[PDB]
RNA sequence: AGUUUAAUGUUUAAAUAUUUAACUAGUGAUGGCACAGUUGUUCUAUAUGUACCUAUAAAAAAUAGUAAAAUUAUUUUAAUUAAAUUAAUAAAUAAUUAUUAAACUAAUUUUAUAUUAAUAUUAUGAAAAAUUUUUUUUUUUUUUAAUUUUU
RNA sequence: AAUUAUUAUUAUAAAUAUUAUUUUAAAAAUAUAAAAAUAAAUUAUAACAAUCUAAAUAAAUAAUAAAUUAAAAUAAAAAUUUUAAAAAAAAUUAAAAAAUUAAAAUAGGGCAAGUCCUACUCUCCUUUACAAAGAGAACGUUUAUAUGUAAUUGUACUAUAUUUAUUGAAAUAAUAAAAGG
RNA sequence: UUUUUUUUUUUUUUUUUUUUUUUUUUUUUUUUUU
RNA sequence: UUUUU
């Protein structure tokens, strides 16, 4: 539809798949407060 | 999920009202083995003063003693009552109203307009198969609403359902009776524990179901003939001791159309083909021509 | 002829001149009076005198039919008369209310030789269809003997605000 | 529209909506506010607050707006305040036969409106105004050319002007104002294409250079906006200033009413008239009787068949058409205006912008167009009076009613380009477009 | 909407004109303007109007600038911010213009199945109406509902009325705020979003399908049927439910799911006493006159009202899903009059 | 063992085959003869007339004037890229790209600049509100070359 | 019947000729076909059994842009995604399943116009006609005339009007083409 | 033109009824909204 | 023409 929020994927096991999604300027660029598993 | 109009007619009166307020001539289509089950709850309070054509179908099943009283005390009060055994149709109770306005309309104003005729009744007994009689034929013989006979659409033929809004049949043509349809109001299926044997007994609502089986319809077609005579007569009719002693016997020695898988020495017949015959003979009016209201001789 | 007679608001007769010359077809020159009815619109209702002109055959009752045409060609109707009377018809009528979600005409009144309908406080979709159209026609004409010119202009509107 | 008017010239440029709200601020002169007031007019409407000092300043414009919403103050008004500078400050010289400003006017019964309305303007002092329409001998009636004239204002149609000037009688030498009225329609081949040819001759005399630099004030002034009216006015005139209110423009008024009548029948179209002209109207100075109303033909063929048909029924009809003689067709104006005969069969000389007390506006054939449906309609509710048109529509154009009828219960501008009538527009939607008959079906059914 | 802003422009109210002076105002958000001028409205009162179009317009040039609560003002054109003061008229302005002892406060907290800080929901007891009908004396839920109030919220706020003969689950709001959102989760589902159960005495037609009758409501209780297929386009609504026998007594009952599509009244049990003519074990009220509790070997003693209708509204899927990521499902356990017959048939009786 | 239907078959033993499914009891009929396409039979199905009823056969052109599809040749030597729009009495040019040609002066660096005519070419499609990221589609081979830092 | 092919081409006559074409040593699905139970022939049965290999010989069919791939995860394009990118580590072979890949911008409601449909009062070119004239009209023919819808058609003094009266209708229930949910 | 007369279309001297919605109350009640 | 919400 419309597509937002994209997602730039550098390495695995190095960019931690929150950073994936940054480089978005939002609340993201955080810490994600409660991570799953 | 093709059900019909459900609730208490008892709320079904203040619109009732209004629709006698427009109307002219009250009918009505009754079965005369019950006099006052097939009624609507308002017949005492419905009008008190609209010409009431008030008729009892299939009369010659229904006892000729309760058929005076019934007959003058509609007669007392003015509102008129015809009983027809049906056999000759219909056609003799169109006569009816042919000759049951022309004694007592009021004149008309203007030279053609009509006798709005407001009909009510079960439909199951008489009311369906009189409209819808006189429904179909004024499709091809034509008097009124004006139009080729062409806008039928596909599937339909008769139309009492889904529109039932100022439809309504052209009896009659010169002195132009015509009728309305009352959307059906009666037998609300919310009835008594005993109307619904009462109902099922007249071949009305001749559903005999897990609802009401046989063998509770039988019990009281046999316990309301507790005068065994003239039924016996049925009974010993074949090949029965005259007195059954109760509804084991009777039941039972009725079982030479009746039977199921039984043993060359021991044999199990089966009591519900019995149960059906003595339930739908009773509703030809075979085994006796008896009524089974109590006809009040009070007012009420 | 007649049906553009019959659109122009004038009261018309049919005139079978020539009829002595015909072999006295009553009943075979009868069509003109079967003609008239069979599919014909609105011009029915009318009066299909017979004459002969050398003959005199009906010239005086001729001269009967056009001067009672003159008498309903101007007849107005007491605006209570009416509706007294349309209400009798709606009573009985077999329009289902999809053809015309119009309700009670209220208040047909007659402005000159032809009526008006005024529609029960629709302020709504107008007209009404042709079907439901002449069946107000064809009984107008019925009752109040209007047939000497069996055509009036039925003119509809809604009540305003 | 917004997604629009950009790819079209006069417009996707600034369109001047700075409301100035008050005469005061506006700085028009209190000899010309006492004048105002004098007729009735304290507040200023849309249109006027916007245009009157985007003309009081020297801003070629195009005024635009709705119906009756008071445009014949908003180009006059401000005119008349740049002439009393003009003779006053500048102390520019009348001259003979050189006309400050002319004005244009499609219409004779529209012209005289035009000069009175202009003629209560003797607050602004030394301006003499002169209308002149045919008349009899007319030619020997330049004779107020000879004489008196000398008329800053010249208000005329467009085909006489030019016949004052290709004789070498007129000499727009010094025309300061250049003012156009209903120009939707003047610059048109609708009426003589004689609007333009007229701008030339005057823009191509302030760019002549071996005479005084006399920049002509151009002021057209249009209800409608034709694409006939853009292109020669956005790519001949410079700077346009444009006031168009596009949230108030291409739609009849308000308080205005509808009514639309189906008519089957060819002769049933007029007991639906007599029994619309049952409501019983008469006035002091503005067998049946009927209200206010101006009831509009197809033709001036049947103007008079209707005229006849209602005045020998018993009405006290009055007529106006164009083949009428001079003074019937002057008597049978001051019959209607001025109290008298109450109702006026009238053919689209009516319809082209004129002003009065008319209250009801009967369609005896509903038009073919949008610009002869909201100029018939647009004569009866005029500045907020109330009033009702009715529409005796036909089979033949049942689709026109078919969208009227439903671009009124929504408020929709009439396509807000109008068309059908001076731009004929074979593009019915405007733009390089021939609607398709649309699909992506690809069955393609086989025997 | 077109005659919305019709009346808008032709009313003079009071029209309170805010101007927008050049030193404090312009500039700031206009729902600091409002907010600031008019104490009167709550903020969310004042967020409904600015937002919904009876909304305090501004006016600079020559027409309404209809405007989101964060749009600034302008460079003092006194741009005047009209706010409407007289809505009441052919406008409609809109939302925002005993005790209960113990035995009662206890016996409202064992009828809790699940609580957070969004909603409630509760077990009703087979026969406790919702709404007061003997408006000073029936016991219904409404007025136990400051019992509920746990953790002194506001009054949680009633969802949908299940009806008196209804066992089962009902749902409250918690929060006015919260009801808003919880309405898009009613009315008109196109999947199913709850379970009745119920024990229809007589096994219907195929134990799989979907029922869409047409109701039409008569005051009084006129209650009609399918009269058109299409619909009468007037006066009726249809009902939908996608009707499942999960087991059946061999010929004369049935435990039946139904998934009620739709919001219709008694559409549970309508349907049901049309599914077949079966309706459900003590439906006295449309079905129910088969025989007293349809005569089984069953409590029969008075029978003629002592069966409660076996009706339950078991399983309802909230939307607001639980610690793993399920949508949560309340499970109202059966009450004993359905555990009385699900036990005396030997059923597994899903709690 | 002759009569209006259901599965398998699915280039199948068949370019409709085997079994399933709905009623009539030959003193009146298997072809004799007969009918034919802007029309036969017609128990009136716009069903059937030799394995596609657009019947078949022959001869022909208006028949993509139709998002139709194709349209045969490397190494080259001039540019632009969305712009246009008025139905209709005496108002300087539609615009595009294209082919082919034409002329430097009041008008500055001792700068810079594709203007004109003739012909060829007019269908690449917005509805509402608001308002007075970026330059890339296109490279002769060898090198050369300035836009990088984590939470 | 395309054949050396599903086949007694049977109008007739008939009744004890052994009267001269059918491979294979396995297993599943299927296909035909098959002892027992909730007075009759039936069931369903998707249950034993029974028949249908392989290899050898013979050989067709539709299909085919090619790949350098192709396991598996994972984001990125008016987009619907064929690719590409990070991250992985994905082996041959035969057999059997069909989960995915290779066969239409559709189904259902609610609206409005259109074709189909009927119906004629007014529309156009019908021809087949009939009467009329013409011949002392036993008839054959050639002109002048309005009938049926026969039957096909179509019908929403410089100004300021004009280019449309010119067939009229019907939930015409189904089709078509649109929008709207 | 031709300029004269005292004017003149002047002549002239070469929402629902009627005679606000909905959330599956049992009349009158709830609660949300416009 | 007028009742009702
Ligand atoms: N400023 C004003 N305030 C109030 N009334 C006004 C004002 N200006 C004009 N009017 C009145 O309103 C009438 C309608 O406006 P007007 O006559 O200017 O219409 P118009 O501009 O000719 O109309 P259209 O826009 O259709 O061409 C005027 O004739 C006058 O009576």
């Given at each position: 539809?419309?597509?937002?929020?994209?997602?730039?994927?550098?390495?695995?096991?190095?960019?931690?798949?929150?950073?994936?999604?940054?480089?978005?300027?939002?609340?993201?660029?955080?810490?994600?407060?409660?991570?799953?598993? | 999920?093709?059900?019909?109009?459900?609730?208490?007619?008892?709320?079904?009166?203040?619109?009732?009202?209004?629709?006698?307020?427009?109307?002219?001539?009250?009918?009505?289509?009754?079965?005369?083995?019950?006099?006052?089950?097939?009624?609507?709850?308002?017949?005492?309070?419905?009008?008190?003063?609209?010409?009431?054509?008030?008729?009892?179908?299939?009369?010659?099943?229904?006892?000729?003693?309760?058929?005076?009283?019934?007959?003058?005390?509609?007669?007392?009060?003015?509102?008129?009552?015809?009983?027809?055994?049906?056999?000759?149709?219909?056609?003799?109770?169109?006569?009816?109203?042919?000759?049951?306005?022309?004694?007592?309309?009021?004149?008309?104003?203007?030279?053609?307009?009509?006798?709005?005729?407001?009909?009510?009744?079960?439909?199951?007994?008489?009311?369906?198969?009189?409209?819808?009689?006189?429904?179909?034929?004024?499709?091809?013989?034509?008097?009124?609403?004006?139009?080729?006979?062409?806008?039928?659409?596909?599937?339909?033929?008769?139309?009492?359902?889904?529109?039932?809004?100022?439809?309504?049949?052209?009896?009659?043509?010169?002195?132009?009776?015509?009728?309305?349809?009352?959307?059906?109001?009666?037998?609300?299926?919310?009835?008594?524990?005993?109307?619904?044997?009462?109902?099922?007994?007249?071949?009305?609502?001749?559903?005999?179901?897990?609802?009401?089986?046989?063998?509770?319809?039988?019990?009281?077609?046999?316990?309301?003939?507790?005068?065994?005579?003239?039924?016996?007569?049925?009974?010993?009719?074949?090949?029965?001791?005259?007195?059954?002693?109760?509804?084991?016997?009777?039941?039972?020695?009725?079982?030479?159309?009746?039977?199921?898988?039984?043993?060359?020495?021991?044999?199990?017949?089966?009591?519900?083909?019995?149960?059906?015959?003595?339930?739908?003979?009773?509703?030809?009016?075979?085994?006796?021509?008896?009524?089974?209201?109590?006809?009040?001789?009070?007012?009420? | 002829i007649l049906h553009k007679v019959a659109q122009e608001g004038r009261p018309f007769?049919?005139?079978?001149?020539?009829?002595?010359?015909?072999?006295?077809?009553?009943?075979?020159?009868?069509?003109?009076?079967?003609?008239?009815?069979?599919?014909?619109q609105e011009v029915?209702?009318?009066?299909?005198?017979?004459?002969?002109?050398?003959?005199?055959?009906?010239?005086?009752?001729?001269?009967?039919?056009?001067?009672?045409?003159?008498?309903?060609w101007n007849?107005?109707?007491?605006?209570?008369?009416?509706?007294?009377?349309?209400?009798?018809?709606?009573?009985?009528?077999?329009?289902?209310?999809?053809?015309?979600?119009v309700?009670?005409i209220?208040?047909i009144s007659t402005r000159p030789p032809t009526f008006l309908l005024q529609l029960?406080?629709?302020?709504?979709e107008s007209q009404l269809p042709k079907?439901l159209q002449e069946?107000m026609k064809?009984?107008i004409?019925?009752?109040?003997?209007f047939?000497?010119v069996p055509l009036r202009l039925v003119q509809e509107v809604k009540d305003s605000? | 529209?917004?997604?629009?008017?950009?790819?079209?010239?006069?417009?996707?440029?600034?369109?001047?909506?700075?409301?100035?709200?008050?005469?005061?601020?506006?700085?028009?002169?209190?000899?010309?506010?006492?004048?105002?007031?004098?007729?009735?007019?304290?507040?200023?409407?849309?249109?006027?607050?916007?245009?009157?000092?985007?003309?009081?300043?020297?801003?070629?414009?195009?005024?635009?707006?709705?119906?009756?919403?008071?445009?014949?103050?908003?180009?006059?008004?401000?005119?008349?305040?740049?002439?009393?500078?003009?003779?006053?400050?500048?102390?520019?010289?009348?001259?003979?036969?050189?006309?400050?400003?002319?004005?244009?006017?499609?219409?004779?019964?529209?012209?005289?409106?035009?000069?009175?309305?202009?003629?209560?303007?003797?607050?602004?002092?030394?301006?003499?105004?002169?209308?002149?329409?045919?008349?009899?001998?007319?030619?020997?009636?330049?004779?107020?050319?000879?004489?008196?004239?000398?008329?800053?204002?010249?208000?005329?149609?467009?085909?006489?002007?030019?016949?004052?000037?290709?004789?070498?009688?007129?000499?727009?030498?010094?025309?300061?104002?250049?003012?156009?009225?209903?120009?939707?329609?003047?610059?048109?081949?609708?009426?003589?294409?004689?609007?333009?040819?007229?701008?030339?001759?005057?823009?191509?005399?302030?760019?002549?250079?071996?005479?005084?630099?006399?920049?002509?004030?151009?002021?057209?002034?249009?209800?409608?906006?034709?694409?006939?009216?853009?292109?020669?006015?956005?790519?001949?005139?410079?700077?346009?200033?444009?006031?168009?209110?596009?949230?108030?423009?291409?739609?009849?008024?308000?308080?205005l009413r509808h009514r639309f009548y189906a008519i089957r029948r060819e002769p049933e179209k007029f007991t639906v008239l007599m029994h619309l002209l049952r409501k019983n109207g008469?006035?002091?100075?503005?067998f049946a009787e009927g209200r206010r109303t101006i009831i509009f033909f197809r033709n001036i063929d049947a103007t008079t068949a209707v005229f006849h048909q209602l005045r020998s029924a018993g009405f006290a009809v009055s007529l106006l058409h164009?083949?009428?003689?001079?003074?019937?067709?002057?008597?049978?104006?001051?019959?209607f205006?001025?109290?008298?005969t109450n109702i006026l069969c009238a053919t689209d000389v009516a319809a082209?912008?004129?002003?009065?007390?008319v209250d009801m506006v009967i369609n005896f054939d509903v038009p073919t167009n949008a610009?002869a449906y909201l100029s018939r309609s647009?004569r009866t509710?005029?500045?907020?009076?109330?009033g009702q048109v009715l529409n005796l529509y036909n089979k033949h154009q049942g689709v026109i009613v078919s969208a009227i009828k439903?671009?009124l219960?929504?408020?929709?501008?009439?396509?807000?380009?109008?068309?059908?009538?001076?731009?004929?527009?074979?593009?019915?939607?405007?733009?390089?477009?021939?609607?398709?008959?649309?699909?992506?079906?690809?069955?393609?059914?086989?025997? | 909407?077109?005659?919305?802003?019709?009346?808008?422009?032709?009313?003079?109210?009071?029209?309170?004109?805010?101007?927008?002076?050049?030193?404090?105002?312009?500039?700031?958000?206009?729902?600091?303007?409002?907010?600031?001028?008019?104490?009167?409205?709550?903020?969310?009162?004042?967020?409904?109007?600015?937002?919904?179009?009876?909304?305090?317009?501004?006016?600079?040039?020559?027409?309404?600038?209809?405007?989101?609560?964060?749009?600034?003002?302008?460079?003092?054109?006194?741009?005047?911010?009209?706010?409407?003061?007289?809505?009441?008229?052919?406008?409609?302005?809109?939302?925002?213009?005993?005790?209960?002892?113990?035995?009662?406060?206890?016996?409202?907290?064992?009828?809790?199945?699940?609580?957070?800080?969004?909603?409630?929901?509760?077990?009703?007891?087979?026969?406790?109406?919702?709404?007061?009908?003997?408006?000073?004396?029936?016991?219904?839920?409404?007025?136990?509902?400051?019992?509920?109030?746990?953790?002194?919220?506001?009054?949680?706020?009633?969802?949908?009325?299940?009806?008196?003969?209804?066992?089962?689950?009902?749902?409250?709001?918690?929060?006015?705020?919260?009801?808003?959102?919880?309405?898009?989760?009613?009315?008109?589902?196109?999947?199913?979003?709850?379970?009745?159960?119920?024990?229809?005495?007589?096994?219907?037609?195929?134990?799989?399908?979907?029922?869409?009758?047409?109701?039409?409501?008569?005051?009084?209780?006129?209650?009609?049927?399918?009269?058109?297929?299409?619909?009468?386009?007037?006066?009726?609504?249809?009902?939908?439910?996608?009707?499942?026998?999960?087991?059946?007594?061999?010929?004369?009952?049935?435990?039946?799911?139904?998934?009620?599509?739709?919001?219709?009244?008694?559409?549970?049990?309508?349907?049901?006493?049309?599914?077949?003519?079966?309706?459900?074990?003590?439906?006295?009220?449309?079905?129910?006159?088969?025989?007293?509790?349809?005569?089984?070997?069953?409590?029969?003693?008075?029978?003629?009202?002592?069966?409660?209708?076996?009706?339950?509204?078991?399983?309802?899927?909230?939307?607001?899903?639980?610690?793993?990521?399920?949508?949560?499902?309340?499970?109202?356990?059966?009450?004993?009059?359905?555990?009385?017959?699900?036990?005396?048939?030997?059923?597994?009786?899903?709690?």
């Amino acid at each position: 539809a419309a597509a937002a929020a994209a997602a730039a994927a550098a390495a695995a096991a190095a960019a931690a798949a929150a950073a994936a999604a940054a480089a978005a300027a939002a609340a993201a660029a955080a810490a994600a407060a409660a991570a799953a598993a | 999920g093709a059900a019909w109009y459900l609730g208490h007619m008892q709320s079904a009166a203040n619109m009732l009202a209004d629709k006698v307020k427009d109307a002219d001539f009250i009918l009505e289509i009754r079965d005369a083995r019950l006099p006052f089950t097939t009624e609507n709850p308002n017949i005492r309070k419905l009008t008190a003063g609209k010409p009431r054509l008030i008729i009892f179908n299939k009369a010659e099943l229904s006892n000729e003693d309760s058929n005076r009283a019934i007959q003058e005390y509609y007669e007392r009060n003015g509102a008129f009552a015809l009983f027809t055994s049906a056999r000759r149709c219909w056609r003799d109770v169109v006569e009816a109203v042919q000759r049951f306005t022309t004694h007592i309309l009021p004149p008309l104003p203007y030279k053609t307009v009509a006798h709005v005729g407001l009909v009510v009744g079960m439909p199951n007994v008489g009311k369906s198969t009189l409209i819808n009689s006189l429904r179909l034929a004024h499709e091809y013989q034509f008097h009124r609403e004006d139009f080729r006979r062409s806008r039928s659409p596909e599937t339909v033929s008769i139309t009492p359902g889904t529109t039932r809004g100022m439809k309504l049949v052209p009896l009659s043509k010169d002195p132009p009776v015509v009728l309305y349809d009352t959307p059906g109001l009666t037998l609300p299926g919310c009835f008594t524990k005993e109307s619904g044997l009462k109902l099922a007994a007249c071949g009305i609502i001749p559903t005999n179901d897990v609802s009401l089986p046989q063998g509770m319809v039988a019990r009281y077609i046999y316990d309301i003939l507790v005068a065994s005579g003239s039924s016996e007569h049925m009974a010993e009719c074949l090949h029965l001791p005259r007195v059954p002693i109760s509804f084991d016997d009777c039941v039972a020695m009725i079982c030479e159309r009746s039977g199921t898988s039984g043993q060359t020495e021991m044999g199990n017949l089966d009591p519900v083909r019995a149960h059906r015959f003595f339930v739908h003979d009773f509703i030809m009016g075979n085994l006796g021509k008896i009524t089974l209201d109590v006809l009040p001789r009070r007012l009420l | 002829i007649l049906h553009k007679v019959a659109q122009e608001g004038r009261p018309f007769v049919l005139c079978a001149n020539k009829w002595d010359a015909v072999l006295d077809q009553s009943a075979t020159a009868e069509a003109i009076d079967f003609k008239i009815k069979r599919q014909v619109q609105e011009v029915k209702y009318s009066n299909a005198v017979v004459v002969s002109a050398h003959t005199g055959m009906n010239l005086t009752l001729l001269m009967d039919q056009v001067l009672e045409l003159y008498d309903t060609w101007n007849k107005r109707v007491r605006r209570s008369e009416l509706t007294k009377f349309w209400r009798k018809l709606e009573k009985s009528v077999i329009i289902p209310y999809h053809v015309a979600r119009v309700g009670r005409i209220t208040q047909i009144s007659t402005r000159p030789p032809t009526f008006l309908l005024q529609l029960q406080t629709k302020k709504e979709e107008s007209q009404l269809p042709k079907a439901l159209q002449e069946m107000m026609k064809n009984a107008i004409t019925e009752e109040f003997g209007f047939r000497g010119v069996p055509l009036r202009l039925v003119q509809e509107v809604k009540d305003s605000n | 529209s917004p997604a629009r008017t950009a790819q079209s010239p006069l417009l996707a440029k600034p369109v001047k909506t700075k409301v100035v709200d008050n005469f005061a601020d506006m700085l028009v002169t209190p000899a010309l506010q006492e004048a105002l007031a004098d007729m009735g007019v304290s507040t200023p409407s849309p249109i006027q607050q916007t245009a009157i000092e985007a003309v009081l300043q020297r801003k070629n414009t195009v005024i635009a707006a709705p119906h009756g919403e008071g445009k014949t103050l908003a180009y006059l008004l401000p005119l008349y305040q740049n002439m009393e500078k003009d003779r006053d400050v500048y102390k520019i010289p009348l001259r003979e036969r050189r006309p400050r400003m002319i004005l244009l006017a499609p219409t004779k019964e529209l012209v005289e409106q035009l000069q009175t309305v202009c003629a209560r303007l003797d607050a602004a002092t030394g301006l003499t105004s002169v209308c002149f329409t045919s008349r009899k001998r007319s030619k020997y009636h330049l004779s107020r050319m000879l004489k008196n004239t000398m008329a800053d204002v010249l208000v005329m149609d467009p085909k006489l002007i030019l016949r004052l000037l290709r004789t070498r009688r007129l000499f727009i030498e010094d025309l300061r104002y250049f003012a156009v009225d209903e120009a939707d329609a003047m610059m048109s081949s609708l009426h003589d294409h004689d609007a333009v040819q007229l701008l030339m001759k005057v823009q191509k005399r302030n760019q002549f250079k071996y005479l005084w630099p006399v920049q002509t004030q151009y002021v057209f002034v249009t209800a409608y906006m034709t694409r006939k009216l853009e292109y020669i006015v956005g790519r001949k005139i410079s700077d346009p200033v444009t006031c168009m209110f596009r949230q108030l423009m291409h739609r009849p008024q308000a308080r205005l009413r509808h009514r639309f009548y189906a008519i089957r029948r060819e002769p049933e179209k007029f007991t639906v008239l007599m029994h619309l002209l049952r409501k019983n109207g008469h006035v002091p100075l503005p067998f049946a009787e009927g209200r206010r109303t101006i009831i509009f033909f197809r033709n001036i063929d049947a103007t008079t068949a209707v005229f006849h048909q209602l005045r020998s029924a018993g009405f006290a009809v009055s007529l106006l058409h164009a083949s009428l003689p001079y003074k019937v067709r002057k008597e049978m104006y001051a019959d209607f205006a001025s109290g008298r005969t109450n109702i006026l069969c009238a053919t689209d000389v009516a319809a082209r912008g004129l002003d009065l007390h008319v209250d009801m506006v009967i369609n005896f054939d509903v038009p073919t167009n949008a610009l002869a449906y909201l100029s018939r309609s647009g004569r009866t509710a005029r500045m907020g009076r109330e009033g009702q048109v009715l529409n005796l529509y036909n089979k033949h154009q049942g689709v026109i009613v078919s969208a009227i009828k439903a671009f009124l219960k929504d408020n929709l501008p009439m396509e807000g380009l109008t068309n059908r009538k001076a731009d004929m527009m074979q593009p019915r939607y405007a733009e390089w477009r021939t609607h398709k008959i649309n699909a992506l079906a690809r069955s393609y059914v086989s025997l | 909407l077109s005659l919305q802003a019709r009346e808008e422009l032709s009313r003079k109210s009071n029209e309170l004109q805010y101007h927008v002076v050049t030193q404090d105002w312009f500039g700031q958000r206009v729902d600091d303007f409002v907010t600031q001028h008019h104490p009167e409205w709550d903020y969310e009162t004042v967020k409904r109007l600015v937002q919904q179009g009876h909304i305090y317009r501004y006016r600079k040039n020559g027409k309404k600038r209809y405007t989101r609560l964060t749009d600034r003002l302008e460079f003092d054109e006194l741009v005047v911010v009209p706010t409407a003061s007289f809505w009441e008229r052919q406008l409609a302005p809109p939302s925002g213009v005993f005790h209960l002892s113990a035995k009662t406060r206890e016996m409202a907290q064992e009828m809790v199945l699940f609580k957070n800080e969004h909603v409630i929901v509760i077990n009703k007891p087979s026969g406790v109406p919702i709404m007061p009908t003997h408006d000073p004396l029936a016991m219904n839920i409404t007025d136990l509902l400051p019992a509920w109030r746990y953790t002194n919220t506001q009054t949680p706020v009633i969802c949908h009325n299940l009806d008196t003969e209804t066992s089962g689950c009902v749902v409250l709001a918690r929060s006015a705020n919260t009801h808003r959102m919880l309405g898009r989760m009613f009315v008109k589902r196109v999947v199913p979003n709850s379970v009745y159960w119920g024990f229809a005495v007589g096994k219907p037609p195929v134990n799989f399908g979907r029922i869409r009758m047409h109701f039409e409501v008569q005051k009084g209780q006129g209650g009609d049927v399918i009269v058109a297929r299409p619909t009468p386009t007037a006066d009726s609504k249809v009902g939908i439910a996608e009707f499942v026998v999960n087991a059946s007594a061999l010929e004369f009952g049935s435990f039946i799911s139904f998934y009620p599509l739709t919001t219709r009244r008694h559409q549970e049990r309508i349907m049901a006493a049309h599914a077949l003519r079966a309706p459900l074990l003590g439906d006295a009220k449309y079905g129910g006159e088969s025989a007293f509790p349809h005569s089984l070997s069953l409590f029969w003693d008075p029978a003629r009202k002592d069966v409660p209708l076996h009706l339950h509204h078991r399983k309802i899927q909230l939307p607001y899903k639980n610690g793993a990521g399920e949508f949560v499902c309340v499970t109202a356990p059966l009450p004993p009059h359905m555990e009385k017959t699900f036990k005396r048939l030997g059923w597994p009786v899903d709690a």
